[PDB]
Structure 1
Amino acid sequence: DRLLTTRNGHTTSTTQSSVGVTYGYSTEEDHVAGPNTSGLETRVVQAERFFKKFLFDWTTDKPFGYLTKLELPTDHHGVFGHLVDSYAYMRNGWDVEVSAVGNQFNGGCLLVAMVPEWKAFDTREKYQLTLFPHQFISPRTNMTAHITVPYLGVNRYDQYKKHKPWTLVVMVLSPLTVSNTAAPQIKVYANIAPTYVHVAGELPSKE
């Protein structure tokens, strides 16, 4: 038994095939009350919960190097999304969970990583993606990958409408294998939660 139940606000998620949590670059957030926001920033705890996003269908024809990316923050229709339209500046980290459920008779391996300041990588650079916070998903071992990263960037606070510091990537490392007893394909989903959400600079109403 490798059971892990994660809780973010009034939302929880539990796996029975956990391989642990990978923390990237740091175990904690740096100072959220710096000189750039004077003392006007505030934390908004109601935005710290899980939202969902479909990533891609892991099929037998997708070869090594096949890669899907999700730039964060992404479109959000909950309180976090409202925060982006209501405040000039924000900062937060991410608690990311990615599930690829098929069955134990499937083979192959997916590399799930969190990359700061994304750039389209060469196929040669794809061999070094493990330099970034990551974890793997191989049907023989697990169905869930879990990574937790802090806020970062040249600026202590950001304007997400103009810049996206983090981007989740899932790359095929070894192609999916199927048999008569295996799942024919595996859909890959993300369960994401923003952490330590802080906002500054109240914006006017649209009226």
Structure 2
Amino acid sequence: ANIVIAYGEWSVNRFFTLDTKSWAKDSKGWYWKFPDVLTEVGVFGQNAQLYRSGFCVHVQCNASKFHQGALLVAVLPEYVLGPGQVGAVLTHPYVLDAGIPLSQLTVCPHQWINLRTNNCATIIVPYMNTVPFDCNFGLLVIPVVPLDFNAGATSEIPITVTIAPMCAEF
């Protein structure tokens, strides 16, 4: 019952799997911009070229019990800075390149990813806009605690993101 519903309320149907990011000790963070990053994926590849859909995202990390670290996943409606399946990399993870500090990032719906007790987390968010039929929201995954491990172990910890759209009206 770790399902996190955003803001308390709720061949097209299938599980889309994005690329697996390599997350190392010296890394910073990654972010995806929905729907735009998903428009090139699968059935939506030829579909995008109005849309009303809810989004169910799953963030899973496969790591052994010998590592340590923590991530933070969140959903920020209308995230504007101040992109393909590769996403991008934040050059200033403290301000998230928004000029907005990282400590207050938890105001938005979030779930804590801790390599100790939990290997996976998910966030169910609905469609939120002033106009019902239309860069809706970005997905921010940044480590709070950097990775530390003894020599001889695996230096890269894969992070996968699977998108499962629910209640899609095109």
TM range (shorter): 0.7 to 0.9
3-state DSSP class of the match of 2:40?
Answer: coil
In structure 2, relative to structure 1, the CA distance for the partners of 1:77 and 1:68 (3 Å cut) is closer
Instruction: Give the drift of 1:55.
Output: 5.2
For residues 28-77 of structure 1, give each alpha carbon's deviation from its aligned partner in whole angstroms, at most 9, with x where no partner exists: 2xxxxxxxxxxxxxxxxx32321011253211123xxx221100112334
Residue 169 of structure 1, aligned match among 137, 140, 149: 140
Q: How many residues align?
A: 153
In structure 2, relative to structure 1, the CA distance for the partners of 1:25 and 1:198 (3 Å cut) is same
1:108 alignment partner in structure 2: 69
Structure 2 stretches of 5 or more lacking a match?
82-95
- Cα RMSD between the aligned structures? 2.0
In structure 2, relative to structure 1, the CA distance for the partners of 1:110 and 1:77 (3 Å cut) is closer
Q: Comparing both chains, which one has the higher relative contact order based on Cα–Cα distances under 8 Å and sequence gaps of 6 or more?
A: 2
The structure with the greater share of residues assigned to strand is 1
In the alignment, structure 1 residue 76 sits paired with structure 2 residue 58? no
Instruction: Give the drift of 1:182.
Output: 4.8
Instruction: Give the drift of 1:126.
Output: 1.1
8 Å contact kept, 2:16–2:41: no
1:48 alignment partner in structure 2: 13
Q: Which amino acid aligns with 1:96?
A: V
Q: What's the TM-score once normalised by structure 1's chain length?
A: 0.67
Determine the C-alpha separation between the residues in 1 that align with 2:25 and 2:162.
Answer: 24
- The structure whose Rg is larger is 1
